[PDB]
Amino acid sequence: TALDPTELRSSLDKPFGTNRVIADDAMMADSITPAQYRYHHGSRVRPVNWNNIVDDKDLDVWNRLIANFWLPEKVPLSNDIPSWRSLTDLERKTTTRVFTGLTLLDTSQATIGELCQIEHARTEHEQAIYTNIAFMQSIHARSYSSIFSTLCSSEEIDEAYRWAVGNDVLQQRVTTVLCEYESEDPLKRKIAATMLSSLLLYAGFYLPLYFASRGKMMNTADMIRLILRDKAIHGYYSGYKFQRGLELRSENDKKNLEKFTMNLLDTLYDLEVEYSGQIYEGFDFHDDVFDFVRYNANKALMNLGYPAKYSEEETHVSPEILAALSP
Amino acid sequence: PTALDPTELRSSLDKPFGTNRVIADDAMMADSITPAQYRYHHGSRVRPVNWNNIVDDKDLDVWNRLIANFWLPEKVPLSNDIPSWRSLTDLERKTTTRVFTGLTLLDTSQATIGELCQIEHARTEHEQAIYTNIAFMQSIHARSYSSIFSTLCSSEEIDEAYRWAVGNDVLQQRVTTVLCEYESEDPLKRKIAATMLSSLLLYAGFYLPLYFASRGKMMNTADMIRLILRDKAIHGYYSGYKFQRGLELRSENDKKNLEKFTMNLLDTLYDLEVEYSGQIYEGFDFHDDVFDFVRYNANKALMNLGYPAKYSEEETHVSPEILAALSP
Numbered sequence: 001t002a003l004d005p006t007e008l009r010s011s012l013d014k015p016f017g018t019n020r021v022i023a024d025d026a027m028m029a030d031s032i033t034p035a036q037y038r039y040h041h042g043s044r045v046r047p048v049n050w051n052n053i054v055d056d057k058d059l060d061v062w063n064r065l066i067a068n069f070w071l072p073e074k075v076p077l078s079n080d081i082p083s084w085r086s087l088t089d090l091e092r093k094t095t096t097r098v099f100t101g102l103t104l105l106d107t108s109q110a111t112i113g114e115l116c117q118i119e120h121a122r123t124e125h126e127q128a129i130y131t132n133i134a135f136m137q138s139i140h141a142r143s144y145s146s147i148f149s150t151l152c153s154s155e156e157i158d159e160a161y162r163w164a165v166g167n168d169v170l171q172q173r174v175t176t177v178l179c180e181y182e183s184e185d186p187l188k189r190k191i192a193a194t195m196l197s198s199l200l201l202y203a204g205f206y207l208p209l210y211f212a213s214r215g216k217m218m219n220t221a222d223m224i225r226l227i228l229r230d231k232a233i234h235g236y237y238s239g240y241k242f243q244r245g246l247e248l249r250s251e252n253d254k255k256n257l258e259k260f261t262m263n264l265l266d267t268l269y270d271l272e273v274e275y276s277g278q279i280y281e282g283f284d285f286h287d288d289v290f291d292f293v294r295y296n297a298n299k300a301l302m303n304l305g306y307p308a309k310y311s312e313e314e315t316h317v318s319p320e321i322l323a324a325l326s327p
Numbered sequence: 328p329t330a331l332d333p334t335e336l337r338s339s340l341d342k343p344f345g346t347n348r349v350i351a352d353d354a355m356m357a358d359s360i361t362p363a364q365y366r367y368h369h370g371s372r373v374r375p376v377n378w379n380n381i382v383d384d385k386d387l388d389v390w391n392r393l394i395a396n397f398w399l400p401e402k403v404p405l406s407n408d409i410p411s412w413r414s415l416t417d418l419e420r421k422t423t424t425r426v427f428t429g430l431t432l433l434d435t436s437q438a439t440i441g442e443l444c445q446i447e448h449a450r451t452e453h454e455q456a457i458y459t460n461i462a463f464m465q466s467i468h469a470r471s472y473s474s475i476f477s478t479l480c481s482s483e484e485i486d487e488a489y490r491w492a493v494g495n496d497v498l499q500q501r502v503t504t505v506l507c508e509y510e511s512e513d514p515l516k517r518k519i520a521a522t523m524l525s526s527l528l529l530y531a532g533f534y535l536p537l538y539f540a541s542r543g544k545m546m547n548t549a550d551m552i553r554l555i556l557r558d559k560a561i562h563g564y565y566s567g568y569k570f571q572r573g574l575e576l577r578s579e580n581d582k583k584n585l586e587k588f589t590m591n592l593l594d595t596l597y598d599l600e601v602e603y604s605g606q607i608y609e610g611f612d613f614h615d616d617v618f619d620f621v622r623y624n625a626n627k628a629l630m631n632l633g634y635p636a637k638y639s640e641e642e643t644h645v646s647p648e649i650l651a652a653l654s655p
Contacts, residue, residue, distance in 0.1 A: 107362055
């Protein structure tokens with residue numbers, strides 16, 4: 001039926017009774033998580049039970065992500081102020097723009113991208129993990145503003161955010177991902193999330209890693225490595241859960257999901273060349289940036305269980321950038 | 328399941344953005360949107376969160392306080408309550424495990440959908456980030472009841488309590504009543520429900536560990552409960568604050584609808600609390616004090632939404648021992 005705006009939406013459903021029983025095995029098996037309720041009105045909803053782990057990997061990932069909790073306030077970013085001032089004008093402008101673009105991807109993952117993975121999650125503990133990951137992705141996004149607050153003028157921050165809104169290719173990149181989060185196929189959401197965490201930010205992460213390899217912006221680099229410590233697990237876990245859902249799908253669906261994955265990757269790679277090629281046009285490390293992009297694209301594919309797409313020659317990251325990845 | 332070929336990107340259905348790069352003028356910035364709003368505004372430009380452009384100072388204050396209050400159940404020495412737990416009666420232990428499993432169900436719901444559905448129609452981008460912290464901390468709350476069970480309970484006791492919760496019709500009616508409102512397209516109905524969850528629905532359960540602490544029992548568990556209460560008091564205040572920020576931009580028609588809806592939801596949830604917690608606490612002499620405490624917190628939920636109190640001082644007189652237990 002229809003509903004008056006003052007009435008409760010649950011009045012459209014059959015009420016549960018007032019019976020109390022100790023649920024038997026069938027009643028427990030038919031119970032569902034709260035995020036599934038909207039598809040199954042009248043089903044019984046089950047609280048999370050951390051003393052009944054279904055996949056031991058979930059407990060390990062939960063414990064590790066929580067133990068890695070950090071805040072940008074704990075990094076002495078203000079000790080980068082002399083280094084920041086020693087950069088060129090172009091270096092400072094490029095940093096603010098790159099980091100504002102990274103903010104846009106992490107904002108997207110925090111506020112919808114990671115959350116849209118909950119309703120079709122394989123386990124209730126995995127659902128709780130996505131709530132931690134989304135909060136930490138809000139921390140990642142917030143931390144780029146922490147950098148700007150320490151180093152930048154209001155005018156610099158203002159122009160960088162206007163540049164981001166006004167950058168058509170950046171808009172194409174983020175909206176490409178956001179559309180897949182709406183997919184009716186839960187595994188396409190997981191593929192997109194794995195791409196965000198294991199690929200889409202790395203052309204940007206190249207810049208602070210480059211600064212660190214040159215001895216600059218050293219404290220900022222520590223924070224970037226805290227972000228990377230999170231994202232490496234985020235992307236591994238997204239891809240692991242994709243593979244656990246994939247093994248239950250039909251052969252035809254597996255073929256289509258692999259084709260879709262390569263279509264998504266190829267589209268996002270071409271967009272990265274367009275976007276970061278233009279951003280880095282006044283820098284002589286163009287070729288190394290895309291070796292590094294392809295290097296991380298292979299990791300994203302491996303996280304999904306697919307073979308590497310790019311060759312050793314196409315993924316040869318300079319040894320100074322790889323050294324800057326570790327503390 | 329749509330008719331788009333499964334290998335195609337869903338963005339292929341939309342006109343792509345161009346290849347222009349401009350410094351967005353004020354009109355372009357005003358029309359930009361948060362990522363969570365993109366779903367029903369395809370083609371709009373999406374904007375990254377700017378913590379150096381705070382729209383509502385209250386958002387920065389709430390964010391900073393909630394993050395400062397981060398805690399984990401592993402830091403509470405719950406195992407020091409094992410002697411106190413074993414000094415209780417079997418009925419007290421069974422009642423506690425069941426009550427906490429019912430609290431787990433409400434926090435599980437809020438963590439995994441209830442708080443997260445507040446993001447898409449949030450007033451500010453910083454508020455959206457705050458909801459991600461709140462949802463995570465609600466997962467911590469739900470997790471923390473399992474931490475209690477792992478410390479105090481046998482495998483059989485935990486298993487039976489989860490079966491009790493799934494099989495408790497009234498508990499199911501309570502949770503699904505809230506879950507249904509989170510499906511409304513009216514963001515303020517979502518906000519009212521979240522305010523009720525954080526400021527009312529768990530308090531008949533919280534009464535029990537406060538009662539034990541007032542009798543000198545389960546003292547370390549009480550500390551953890553106070554950590555949970557320290558979060559929920561802000562969660563409920565903030566949900567109600569944001570409701571009022573949205574409410575003041577609504578028509579007189581919608582204001583009248585939302586006030587009646589609020590009282591309908593409260594009245595329904597209250598009656599269900601009487602049925603649910605009245606049955607659970609039937610064997611205890613504090614039964615009537617529980618509902619003074621329920622009505623006391625119902626008044627706080629209403630006050631958080633900006634509405635007048637419903638219950639009188641005589642209907643909300645919580646015993647001084649329970650109120651003292653709320654403090655360290």
